[PDB]
Amino acid sequence: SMTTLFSKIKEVTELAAVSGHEAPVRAYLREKLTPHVDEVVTDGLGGIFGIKHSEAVDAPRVLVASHMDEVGFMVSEIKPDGTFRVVEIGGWNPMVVSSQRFKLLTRDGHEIPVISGPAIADIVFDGGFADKAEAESFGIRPGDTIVPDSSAILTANEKNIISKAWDNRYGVLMVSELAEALSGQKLGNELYLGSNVQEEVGLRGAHTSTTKFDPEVFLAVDCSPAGDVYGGQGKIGDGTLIRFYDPGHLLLPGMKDFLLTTAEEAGIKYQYYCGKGGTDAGAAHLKNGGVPSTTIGVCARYIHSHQTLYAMDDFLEAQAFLQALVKKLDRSTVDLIKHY
Amino acid sequence: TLFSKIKEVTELAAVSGHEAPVRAYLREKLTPHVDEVVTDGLGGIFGIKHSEAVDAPRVLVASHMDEVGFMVSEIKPDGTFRVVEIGGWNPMVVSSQRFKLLTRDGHEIPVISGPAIADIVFDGGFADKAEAESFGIRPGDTIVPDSSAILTANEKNIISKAWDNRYGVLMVSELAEALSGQKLGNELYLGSNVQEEVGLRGAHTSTTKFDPEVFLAVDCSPAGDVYGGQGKIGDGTLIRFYDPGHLLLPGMKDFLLTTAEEAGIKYQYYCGKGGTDAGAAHLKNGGVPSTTIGVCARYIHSHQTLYAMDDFLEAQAFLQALVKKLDRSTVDLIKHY
Amino acid sequence: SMTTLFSKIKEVTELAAVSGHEAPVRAYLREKLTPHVDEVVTDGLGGIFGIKHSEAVDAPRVLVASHMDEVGFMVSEIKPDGTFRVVEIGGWNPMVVSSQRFKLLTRDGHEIPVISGPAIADIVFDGGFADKAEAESFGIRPGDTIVPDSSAILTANEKNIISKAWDNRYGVLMVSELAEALSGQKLGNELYLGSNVQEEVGLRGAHTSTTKFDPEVFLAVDCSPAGDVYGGQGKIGDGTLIRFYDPGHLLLPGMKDFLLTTAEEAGIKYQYYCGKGGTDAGAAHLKNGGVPSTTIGVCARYIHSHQTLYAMDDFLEAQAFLQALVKKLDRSTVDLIKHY
Numbered sequence A, C: 001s002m003t004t005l006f007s008k009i010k011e012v013t014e015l016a017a018v019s020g021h022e023a024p025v026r027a028y029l030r031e032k033l034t035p036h037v038d039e040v041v042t043d044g045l046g047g048i049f050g051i052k053h054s055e056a057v058d059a060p061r062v063l064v065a066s067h068m069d070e071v072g073f074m075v076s077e078i079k080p081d082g083t084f085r086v087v088e089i090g091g092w093n094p095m096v097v098s099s100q101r102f103k104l105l106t107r108d109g110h111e112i113p114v115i116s117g118p119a120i121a122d123i124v125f126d127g128g129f130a131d132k133a134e135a136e137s138f139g140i141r142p143g144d145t146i147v148p149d150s151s152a153i154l155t156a157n158e159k160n161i162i163s164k165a166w167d168n169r170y171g172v173l174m175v176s177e178l179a180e181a182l183s184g185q186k187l188g189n190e191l192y193l194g195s196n197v198q199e200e201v202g203l204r205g206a207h208t209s210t211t212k213f214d215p216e217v218f219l220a221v222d223c224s225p226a227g228d229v230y231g232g233q234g235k236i237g238d239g240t241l242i243r244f245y246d247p248g249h250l251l252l253p254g255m256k257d258f259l260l261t262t263a264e265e266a267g268i269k270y271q272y273y274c275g276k277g278g279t280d281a282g283a284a285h286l287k288n289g290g291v292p293s294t295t296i297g298v299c300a301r302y303i304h305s306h307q308t309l310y311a312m313d314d315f316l317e318a319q320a321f322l323q324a325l326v327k328k329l330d331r332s333t334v335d336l337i338k339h340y
Numbered sequence B: 001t002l003f004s005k006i007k008e009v010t011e012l013a014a015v016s017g018h019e020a021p022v023r024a025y026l027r028e029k030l031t032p033h034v035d036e037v038v039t040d041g042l043g044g045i046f047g048i049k050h051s052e053a054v055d056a057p058r059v060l061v062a063s064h065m066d067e068v069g070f071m072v073s074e075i076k077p078d079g080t081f082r083v084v085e086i087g088g089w090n091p092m093v094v095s096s097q098r099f100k101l102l103t104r105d106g107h108e109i110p111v112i113s114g115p116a117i118a119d120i121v122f123d124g125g126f127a128d129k130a131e132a133e134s135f136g137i138r139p140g141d142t143i144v145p146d147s148s149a150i151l152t153a154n155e156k157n158i159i160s161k162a163w164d165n166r167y168g169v170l171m172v173s174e175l176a177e178a179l180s181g182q183k184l185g186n187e188l189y190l191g192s193n194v195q196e197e198v199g200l201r202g203a204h205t206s207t208t209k210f211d212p213e214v215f216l217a218v219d220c221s222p223a224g225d226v227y228g229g230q231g232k233i234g235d236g237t238l239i240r241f242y243d244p245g246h247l248l249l250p251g252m253k254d255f256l257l258t259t260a261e262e263a264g265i266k267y268q269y270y271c272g273k274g275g276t277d278a279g280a281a282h283l284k285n286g287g288v289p290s291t292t293i294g295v296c297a298r299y300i301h302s303h304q305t306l307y308a309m310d311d312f313l314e315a316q317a318f319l320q321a322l323v324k325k326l327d328r329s330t331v332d333l334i335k336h337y
């Protein structure tokens, strides 16, 4: 049902968690993970993962990870006049930063409204205070996290959603839905399902979770820019992405075979995609003894802004594809992925 | 003989991520001279040569199998391809060059290039997207330079592609053979990494997997002799004291320099502008002192690299003496803190 | 058969003849012309032509010429370090010059492998010698010709070819095939059939051959840039060219009438073509009392490089068109071309 999918998306995209401060998103995931998994574990930096044990003898470790954080800003100084100067957390196009609603998140638990009024460090951020003292008197300090404020809404044709943070609440929902869907099932792999911390700042959580859990194979779950509207590639509604290239990662032949095989058998709509940015796979695949990877993905328009536009159908295709992928991963198939 | 051996390796096609054909070559050449042939998660191949010596330290010796090339980013409606670069290309050398496009179904299709790399037309002589696709061609396909190894007029030098780093690949092959009979004071790991051209990627994984105490990269670097820079074709193997990614530690330097004099090795000092597998490897585990047993060559990362055979011989003798002299005493000295 | 054509094309394009140095191609044309021709003559600069005598009473002389030279380089100096600086022979886009194989052709007959390592005079040409002395010991001198080194190969679909010097071994082969196919037949014109010297350095041979043989009508046979791939006109496989204009030559109305009439009666596939460069016709038509001309043409992608891409099919359309033209050129038709 589309009405339900939207509600689920509205919930996850309206949660507020900037890199290094993803407790609200973790709390959400813990509550959705626990009932469908044997064990809930955590890495040093705050990443949560459900372990789903396998009855299979040589069950290979498979890690599936999205990321919990979203792009945002962080207070670097409080001016004497009460305004804030910020540092970007995650990559922002300065063209989109001016005149935007945000929520400043205080250490003592305040949620104070803040707007931006072209270098980021010079952009005025404004909470309507009369001076430094008053701002400070509301619990505000240098280091406080500033999250975009944007509700999720259906587009006129009801096929698409406009919201913030589809990157990467898509992957948060995708991970949640996966746990629900595989609950009854018994897999041929030892499944580690969850979400990374601190991806937006340089794939930081993917270093630590991949190391901690020693997976043989890794599937990132993450969305990327759709350039269809800009004459570039990645077209909304054309399905899940086969990410063969990005500056940090090359899709290996063995993995490519398995992706295309699985997509063909489960009747999945997919499109080839040449990434220009990096996903968690970029860091993960270099960890331990080496971990073949990809990113099970959706594209979306205007990533890293308040107004990301994306297709609901793309999610369904991506979900089914992630389901089929993990179901089919076992001793035989990872050995084949890693046939050297 | 040395030429044919170089002709063979240099003409093999293996772009980063797609090095099975070079793995197949190393497998066949490593297996008979080694106790065990192992593989990392990403596809690096290494022979293990067991040592009798008690407390024998682990030594990793690695070149890399991948060369520079391009990858299909899209097929245009008109049947041409736009590409992304796999490994660093100077855009001045890319136009009007032959390539082999490698299909997943096993086709080898002739492709030429016709300024930003993404704007350069890659052409296979197809009428439209459909025809290109009917030949098995898909976004993601590997595109490898098409250039053969030949002798220069004086028969002392070779012109080819991929001497970076089929040098190191051959270097690792000749090492296994030379050490076949021998027994060493070190637990030898001997082979070649994957995906070096795209950021020393495999060097992370192989070094983490095999937990060596000492690491010897085997790679070639630019020669500037002809442009007035440093690095002179024919002046022997490289003493790489510096690059942006890695500093040659005093312990290792003493061991490099000492060995070189003992074995009568011709060598030149060499400050590097680019990285080697050592840059990544030395930072793995608890830390692993490293260098690169190197040769310089003119016009690296092109279809037309030019290099001296003599330099190979020099670096080979140097590699041999180095791993022979590596034992508990000498790696403890190297790590004398 | 398409396989026999490739052989003939591989042959012509692999010969080595930069401007001023076309003995190798001239040796080829002598061997192919003599059996099918009454007489073989030469101009003061090195151009060769077969003379096919006519029985027709007031038979007009008709000159058909390709050119034997290709673009390459010439040693300007030998540096003390053994490398060479060069001067261009023919126009090169400097973008295609770096990292290319060549054969340096010595006066004493050595063929020495040379590669290039942005102004052309600044580009390092490398023979892999130790010093100026060693280079000179191999007979290398300032002036030695440096010829592109590139073999001829079929494209995947076997309809097209990748090689060097299709400009203008196209026309060399076109002139050869003309001789063979017309051997035995008898024409209403005194046919002069052959190839010019030094076209690439300024249509220099076309000056001297035309003056010497005094034709009434001139047919250049030369290939030109396909622009299709860049959104320009001239499309591979679309046929033989109707060169109505170029900076050095205007197609005269009488000649145009003859061209279109002939093509259309002989079922020739053709495409209109506005040239941006010159061909032998530009020099030839201004010689003696005036000599109406065109260029019986074909386009090819990436001219003046090691990697030119062209259709065998186009050659066949050009060849059929050339035959039809020369067979139909006689006193009535050249008089009509010259109807003033």
Ligand SMILES: [Zn+2]
Pocket (backbone or CB within 6 Å): A167, A168, A199, A222, A223, A279
């Ligand atoms: Zn992301």
Ligand SMILES: [Zn+2]
Pocket (backbone or CB within 6 Å): A167, A200, A304
């Ligand atoms: Zn992002």
Ligand SMILES: [Zn+2]
Pocket (backbone or CB within 6 Å): B164, B165, B196, B219, B220
């Ligand atoms: Zn290298």
Ligand SMILES: [Zn+2]
Pocket (backbone or CB within 6 Å): B087, B164, B197, B301
């Ligand atoms: Zn390299």
Ligand SMILES: [Zn+2]
Pocket (backbone or CB within 6 Å): C167, C168, C199, C222, C223, C279
């Ligand atoms: Zn021409």
Ligand SMILES: [Zn+2]
Pocket (backbone or CB within 6 Å): C090, C167, C200, C304
């Ligand atoms: Zn020309």
